[PDB]
Design a protein around this ligand. Structure first.
Ligand SMILES: Nc1ncnc2c1ncn2[C@@H]1O[C@H](COP(=O)(O)OP(=O)(O)O)[C@@H](O)[C@H]1O
Ligand SMILES: Nc1ncnc2c1ncn2[C@@H]1O[C@H](COP(=O)(O)OP(=O)(O)O)[C@@H](O)[C@H]1O
Ligand SMILES: Nc1ncnc2c1ncn2[C@@H]1O[C@H](COP(=O)(O)OP(=O)(O)O)[C@@H](O)[C@H]1O
Ligand SMILES: Nc1ncnc2c1ncn2[C@@H]1O[C@H](COP(=O)(O)OP(=O)(O)O)[C@@H](O)[C@H]1O
Ligand SMILES: Nc1ncnc2c1ncn2[C@@H]1O[C@H](COP(=O)(O)OP(=O)(O)O)[C@@H](O)[C@H]1O
Ligand SMILES: [Mg+2]
Ligand SMILES: [Mg+2]
Ligand SMILES: [Mg+2]
Ligand SMILES: [Mg+2]
Ligand SMILES: [Mg+2]
Lengths: 367, 367, 367, 367, 367
């Protein structure tokens, strides 16, 4: 049986191929103590253990914007995933890994070298995350908008063919929305500065933030009453109240200039990706907008995407956003489907063909 | 029962002798994927299946200007015709094939070798397309103007005798008009460049183009108003509007200098063919101008031919253009009539006389 | 009842003795297809059927200058005459045939062998054409000038006696005038070259040509105006105009040097024939010039003959040209009179006396 | 000194009387630009200048079948001949022109009117081309077969007397052979359609075509091997190979039915011309068959003519074909001899006698 | 004196006719501030001023693929060109403008309306860019391959005549190569996303990119060593190193499938354009391949074009690429030559004839 490990910038989703949900879901964090130990305590903490002790830790994400920046810490996370969360021996399970498109080549080359030389897996494979999301939805045609913690990317696929020249990638996702919410919470006098407090702000975002259908009408509503204001209790019992910050934070996805980015919002990027595709496949792409990832879980985002793309596309086109309730795990679920296919068993990169080609084998066997 | 297969440059018309319409009509195209397959898809697509997936295919016509240029792809089309469209075993049906006059000898020699050695037909026959059009009209006398996708040819026939020295052939037909319409659509800012977009332009032509009775008066009318402008919705919902391009594209048939050809238009070519015939048969040829093929289906082309030839011929001659409503299938219908005649059953090239003479038997048994 | 068949070089005149006009008059031509048959058509065409399809035929005259040169084709014409035009069984009708004087002996010997062994006539007879013309006019004395398509001959007859030493024969008649008109029509740019176009020129001659009373005064008139120019519409609607060719073509009869012949014109030949006769019969011959045949049908030819012979003969002689309006059929009409005479019923060559003497019986029973 | 200008359908041969070769030989063509001029180029090009720029020109022959059909273009060619090729003033040189026999009268009438009123020559003369060929050979007796680009004609001459009734003319010559070679080159897939490509085909003919001694034995040889196949490099570097087309194209001269003509071949036409002559001159005509013109330059044509006429003539007659190596210029060389004769200086049509008679003077002073 | 303004998709080249180099060369960009102004700054920046402040601007090209898409911004660029770079009054200088072939009609109609109604020029003219390149090389014959920032086009010209049916246009040029280099620089971890960073990538391309003579041998060389790797210092002092990206970016010109285009490379397009021309001009076109524009400035592109076309053309043809060192300004230099010709002074569209015909005068006076 194969292991499916979706290493996001934010969460690790790991499990066994054939299952319908990841067995292990924990934050992709390494924490190290930043204070003085006085009682006669590990040197670092991974995952949920780092989250429960974050008050005395400095928390580091080894993956930023889909790119592994700390390889020593990433190896701690993979080690924790295999031996503590799944409790398997990696040397007997083929491992399917995931990646964002348009990543640096050295990223998946080092993932291959570590899987084969540190964990000694028998076979591995690196899939593109948006492609796995289309497996999860049971489709062969559609434009996938995957947005997690690090990357937002669009991959148009038609009858199982990717249009790589139409792939869009935007380094604006959940972690940038968390940083923006931290910044605009200072307007109400709430100061979150440490890495542990950034975890509190992320939890505020996941519970209170939503996408306004019309942003300017929502700003006028929040300015005329308090029907939109909600409260949130902090870990120490302090209660904070937020109003228009609830929809200003997700609005950055549609207006990246809020955080100083020049790029277009996710609706324009989806439309630009479709318009780069051949005219004869555009109608099928308009009807099959698949959303996946945690950053697509905001209340009202599919209705907003529907409205924004409808305004860009021709009036005769039927725009349909496919936002399944389980789309937070679509990449893992699709990787579980793929790794269980009998047609896929020839696609693995085995340890034998890695020894005769080195880590560059991953560039000619994986899309 | 015999198979009648009219292999045009543009369409395959195939069916059974005795019927009144082809059973299978599909585009004579082979499509191959030009993008990267990512989901775990055939290697090539033929006919209507290539048309429905043309967004991700590069489309190739194996026949250009009546001449088969890709014999591997032509065999895919014949295989698709026999086994998928008609669903017959070719080894038990005599097969009537069609050809344009003044084709290279090797073209019908290779058609014979493939019918007898790849499909193992019991008997076959290659007829001239314009002759079959005269069978379809129930005549034995007339000058046939057949214009399809590849070839425009004139064959004068009198009392069942062809005048081969008066046969005219012009490599200017539907596909050259499609290419010209693509070129003049750039004047309005519409860019069609790929082979899939050429299929869209062909559909625009078949719906909006017509033959002006007086070209220069029509150009002045289109320049003074918008009564001639029509709209067309593209596959992706974009609406394009065209005005004088509607009649400028078919005008190339009467003025081949629009596409840089030195030859005369179809009206002068018809007249030159009649003037090469003996003076005593010209009056019967003037009264029996038979038009066939898809390129004669433009609205107003028989009225324009009538007016153009009347101006070339003597004033006492009665010019009559026979343009039946079913003339798009005249070659197939005439081949269906011919293959059902009891007098024709001695004309087949049987497998026995092919084995004692080789593929060159086709040159002494078929006109 | 007897059959009367006048086989001219140009026309067949056939009918029944006792009638006053031939029942069947058709061209003495055999046509064979010279093009490629493509529709699934006889091997040869005779008579009026060859004339209506002459555009695709090569036309052959089996009789040239009164002499049958193609015996297979002549038998097709006789077969067509008996079974298709007259619709009789030749084996029950005595057949009167005609011939020009001074023909080869083998010509009428083969006519006898074919009538008795191919058509099995009960009796036959070969008459001289000029003698039959004198029966048609009701005379027993006169010099007959018979001119058809092949031969012009003079036969002086006095009180029912022929003067055979005074018989003149000139191989210059209608077909040579047609060939000359074809040649001089090239002066105006009209090109008639094929055998079908020779039939068109013959029709021009029969409608527009006439005999000038004074040739040199007519040439000066045609050169000073256009009062003599006439138009003629060709079968394909082209209109041709001819001026002095109208009387230059018949002038060859009076000046055979126009076509390179050394012989004298028909007026000198008539006079030379009379001057070979005995002096005591010349006065009756001068008063009884009988003209017959199609080549004597030109407007103005009797007036020209009258003027030419008057200038040759003594001033005291009364020259009279007998040119009846029906003289185109005089040979047939006279043969109809002869074959109906009760005195002629002993003159037939019966099948019984042909079996005991062979085909040479015709030389001792027919003049 | 006199100018000798032989205006063929294909080439202009011009020079000075007394010389032994034409000074100017160039194609009788007028070219006009058929494309759009973009750089800031004459309106028409004549002769060799039209040949070097034929890629962007439409080429017109003003003479077709010996008859000048475009008088404006013919005047450009004469103007180019006098002022650019010979560089003379025509108003001081008597000009000998040539013509085919049996041409329209208006052709040489307009040549006379243009020479006297446009170029103001002092005197001119129109000779028959075949007669000049007999001057070139130094004979007074012989039957001349002249075949150029437009006309094939036979003129029998005996002791300086022409037999005009025996003159044959056939509108089948070099240009019809070029058109036929273009047609049968399509059997191998070579398409020559434009007027510039017709010039390429003419060059192929002049280098590769020959006359087979026995046509049917040559067809069997070409079908059993490749010893007859030759290659030819096109102007753009493409190499074409032709086999039996090399002798099928000249075979049309002996079998005009290849191009749909009903007439007899040049061997039968030569024999028919001799048989129209008086019996006492035929033996001298059989021994003096003079061939001239470019269409008699095929390798093997004199041997084929010798064999064909020997089979038609009586076995006791000595058939001799006189085919000199310089017979391509025989008409010009003979016209140079004639215009230099002291006996010819009374034969010119002077400007004085043209003013008192008009252009019709040419019909009573020139044969 | 005339103004010559070559408005490319990338650069403005402007100057005075008669000069040998453009006086003003600046980027065809409009920049607008995208940040918040805090110090108490224009609303937009044009040209080199937009390039020096691009850190705080969003940069827009008003011309895309040779077509002006933002007419307000294009008018800012023309205004900046006249009044700030050249420092002239446009109302006293005739202005020669340039355009790519096969542009929309409305593009040059709006250029004419703006020149006459906004800048009030006395006269103007719109030339085709490839034609001006042939003026710059001093030729009248040649096939021009012009490739700038927006368009690659081929125009074959022979003796000053364009063959418009053989004009090829490909919307793949410098800006598409810059976008592709941006995409493949992500393989090494370099992220350029903003419009200002696209200007940095364009500068990398112009300094480090070259055309490999053999692409697959170059890919093997770059994979076996580091002899091809070069460094580049970014504006902020960061040093980037690139290896095979140096020749993969220009390889898109020969393999447009790298960016998902179905079209053929520039070598096949040049050959297809020549093969659409008449066979008699192809040899002169093969010897006169003129390259112009900034996208032909890659090291090794003429050697690669020479090798690619040699492999397509017949072995006997002499392929010669004319790539002058100043070909980056060939369109301007040729327009300077043209606007100085005395023959061109009648070709201007004057303000007088614009008032009587409207902006559509440009379609009947300019090619
Ligand atoms: N209900 C929610 N509403 C808004 N954002 C959410 C929600 N749940 C998760 N997220 C955000 O999704 C991001 C990552 O989710 P995931 O799809 O697992 O991405 P990754 O694969 O990068 O770990 C996190 O930044 C988190 O804040
Ligand atoms: N209604 C129409 N108007 C104009 N053109 C048409 C129409 N229908 C078909 N055609 C053209 O006819 C051409 C071929 O038709 P067809 O007679 O089947 O030719 P072929 O035998 O070469 O396939 C195509 O190029 C198509 O564009
Ligand atoms: N009206 C006419 N004028 C002049 N020639 C005529 C006329 N009618 C017939 N002919 C000519 O008479 C010739 C033969 O007529 P006919 O007396 O029947 O001769 P034959 O007996 O040889 O057939 C033909 O060549 C025809 O051209
Ligand atoms: N060597 C050759 N072999 C065959 N044909 C030739 C040759 N040379 C010339 N011709 C043909 O001769 C024809 C005309 O030659 P020429 O005698 O000058 O005729 P004209 O007088 O009509 O110009 C041309 O059609 C040319 O193709
Ligand atoms: N040395 C060089 N190497 C490669 N590309 C270049 C070079 N110089 C300029 N270019 C490219 O040429 C393109 C435009 O140049 P130019 O010929 O001025 O085109 P335009 O007329 O469209 O402005 C730009 O995209 C630029 O990147
Ligand atoms: Mg993810
Ligand atoms: Mg067809
Ligand atoms: Mg008669
Ligand atoms: Mg000649
Ligand atoms: Mg440019």
């Amino acid at each position: 049986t194969a292991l499916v490990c979706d290493n996001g910038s934010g969460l690790v989703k790991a499990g066994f191929a054939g299952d319908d949900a990841p067995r292990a879901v924990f934050p992709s964090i390494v924490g190290r103590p930043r204070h003085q130990g006085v009682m006669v305590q590990k040197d670092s903490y991974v995952g949920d253990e780092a989250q429960s002790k974050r008050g005395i830790l400095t928390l580091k994400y080894p993956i930023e914007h889909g790119i592994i920046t700390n390889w020593d810490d990433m190896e701690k996370i993979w080690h924790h995933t295999f031996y503590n969360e799944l409790r398997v021996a990696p040397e007997e399970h083929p491992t399917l890994l995931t990646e964002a498109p348009l990543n640096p080549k050295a990223n998946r080359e080092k993932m291959t070298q570590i899987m084969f030389e540190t964990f000694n897996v028998p076979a591995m494979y690196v899939a593109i995350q948006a492609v796995l999301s289309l497996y999860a939805s049971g489709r062969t045609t559609g434009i996938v908008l995957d947005s997690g913690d690090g990357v937002t990317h669009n991959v148009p696929i038609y009858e199982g063919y990717a249009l790589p020249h139409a792939i869009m990638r935007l380094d604006l996702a959940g972690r940038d929305l968390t940083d923006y919410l931290m910044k605009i919470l200072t307007e109400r006098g709430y100061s979150f500065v440490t890495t542990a407090e950034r975890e509190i702000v992320r939890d505020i975002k996941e519970k209170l933030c939503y996408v306004a259908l019309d942003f300017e009408n929502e700003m006028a509503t929040a300015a005329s009453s308090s029907s939109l204001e909600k409260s949130y209790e902090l870990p120490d019992g302090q209660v904070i109240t937020i109003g228009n910050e609830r929809f200003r934070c997700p609005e950055t996805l549609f207006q990246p200039s809020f955080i100083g980015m020049e790029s277009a919002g996710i609706h324009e990027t989806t439309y630009n990706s479709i318009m780069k595709c051949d005219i004869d496949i555009r109608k099928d792409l308009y009807a099959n907008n698949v959303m996946s990832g945690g950053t697509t879980m905001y209340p009202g985002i599919a209705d907003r995407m529907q409205k924004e793309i409808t305004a860009l596309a021709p009036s005769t086109m039927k725009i349909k956003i496919i936002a399944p309730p389980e789309r937070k795990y679509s990449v893992w679920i699709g990787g579980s489907i793929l790794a269980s296919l009998s047609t896929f068993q020839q696609m693995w990169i085995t340890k034998q063909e890695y020894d005769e080609a080195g880590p560059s084998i991953v560039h000619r066997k994986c899309f």
